[PDB]
Amino acid sequence: MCPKDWEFYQARCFFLSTSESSWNESRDFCKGKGSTLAIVNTPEKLKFLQDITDAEKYFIGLIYHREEKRWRWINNSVFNGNVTNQNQNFNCATIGLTKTFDAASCDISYRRICEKNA
Template sequence: MTNNGSSLMDGSKKENIQKFLTQSDQESPVISTIQRQIVTAETLMLLYCILCVVTFLFISVSQIFGSLSPDPNSFIPTSSYGTVCPKQWDFYQGRCFFLSTSELSWNRSKDFCERESATLAIVNTLEKLKFLQNITSAEKYFIGLIYQHAEKRWRWINNSAFNGNVTNWNQNFNCATIGLTKTFDAALCDTSYRSICEKNAK
């Protein structure tokens, strides 16, 4: 009796285990589907959080630096970190340069630059001369160099000495231009040419 009872119990256990395994096999696709749905929901939630963070950063940066489409009077970053030049001005070695498209006399060009809180360009290094020659078109540009008759020498507009050579000079050609050649060229001050303004980068 004991052996028969034990056999019946073992058979019942085996049957229950087999039913459990069969039921588990039948439910596994459902469980897998639920798991996939959970993973998908978690992924969507993560993407939503990332999108929120990116949107927040974009708004913050826009508020700090202003509109991505600056107005004509706005400033734009330059190649040097922490310095900016006004729009349409070129940056070089801590300075901003503006090449005019209108043609004026030397005195009127000087006044124009002063209205822009600048001066006519002081091209007192070979590097600066090469930089400006690279960005000028096939035009003459007045610069801040003028002949002082009393001293019989050329001086920059800030009264510093000029140590180079000016071609084509005569007693009537008392202002200087650059652009068409690789040198400083004398010109009539009352003739209308384009000009180059210069000021400190901010």
């Protein structure tokens, strides 16, 4: 099983924060628990998380790469979905509330989803 307060899905463990912070701060929080920001790279994973996030927005492990002109998952794979409301300024993304991946400022405070192996 997962650690206390973490949630199991297909050999992986997920944590939904109540606290809000910036993307980098969220990266630091997840690392503080030996995890990384969530990679949500399949229909099944997106659905699993959307079902339990409900009505708040959460940073995940999806960032824009200036030098590539594409989004990438933080495990170094190309982004395989669509991000909404992109603009020259936003380099991060959230899920939750909406039905979609949504561009967000890396500097604005959001909750986070951390992920590690079970």
